[PDB]
Amino acid sequence: MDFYYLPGSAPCRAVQMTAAAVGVELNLKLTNLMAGEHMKPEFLKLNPQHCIPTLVDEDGFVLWESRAIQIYLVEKYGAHDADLAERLYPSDPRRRAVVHQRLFFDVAVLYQRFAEYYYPDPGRLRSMEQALEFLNTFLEGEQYVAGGDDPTIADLSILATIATYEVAGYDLRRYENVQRWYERTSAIVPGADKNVEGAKVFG
């Protein structure tokens, strides 16, 4: 399966951790946006939204949005290991609702406000610190972001985001639960060293 990506990119890193978790090997297709590779007609025909990560499966199914990719990887490839899929993406409606809630929080608030503050300011700073405070509150008395006894795809997505906060230069130790979760989760998730490595070397 072809994986159109950039090394420093958080959503790409989330997908790489998820693929490693389900034993999927990705055919890496570096897609340099500065060079305009995502705007070539070959890419546009695959993905009209011209964004990375983009996954092309064995039957030519094309998918983008890292968090939809994560779910697809578990449902289609993780499913061969029943307990594994359950750990990554619990099936109970309530448990799964929380995983979804955290994924939507990651894209619309946590990573969003990171991009709002760092890519162009006291206003967008307070906006971002609020996102971190929310996350800190989510992790109060909890090992993982959506609960559970094991990391879920929500942890993997937020690990990608938070490693970007770290390399940006934000003092994460300010959020005791976030720092704690970040350290312990990075130590236990397969390919999490590649996440930080890739955040650092590129991002």
Ligand X SMILES: N[C@H](CCC(=O)N[C@@H](CS)C(=O)NCC(=O)O)C(=O)O
- Residues marked active site are found at 9
Q: Does 107 bind a copy of itself (CB under 8 A)?
A: yes
For the record, the structure tokens of 127 come out as: 């906006």
**Taking CB within 5 to 8 Å according to partner kind, which of a copy of itself, ligand X, none is near residue 72?**
a copy of itself
Residues whose CB falls within 8 Å of the CB of residue 45, separated by 6 or more in sequence, listed in order:
none
Which residue of 2, 37, 57, 65 would you call a contact of ligand X, by CB under 6 A?
A: 65
Query: For residues 159 and 106, is the Cβ–Cβ distance under 8 A?
Result: no
For the record, the structure tokens of 106 come out as: 């990651």
The β-bridge partners of 3 are 28, 55
Q: Does 33 bind ligand X (CB under 6 A)?
A: yes
For the record, the structure tokens of 157 come out as: 């997505």
Q: Does 177 bind a copy of itself (CB under 8 A)?
A: no
DSSP SS3 for 30 = strand
Applying CB under 6 A, the residues found at the interface with ligand X are 9, 11, 33, 38, 50-53, 65-67, 107-108
Applying CB under 8 A, the residues found at the interface with a copy of itself are 48-49, 61, 63-65, 67-69, 71-72, 75-76, 93-94, 96-98, 100-101, 104-105, 107-109, 112, 134, 137-138
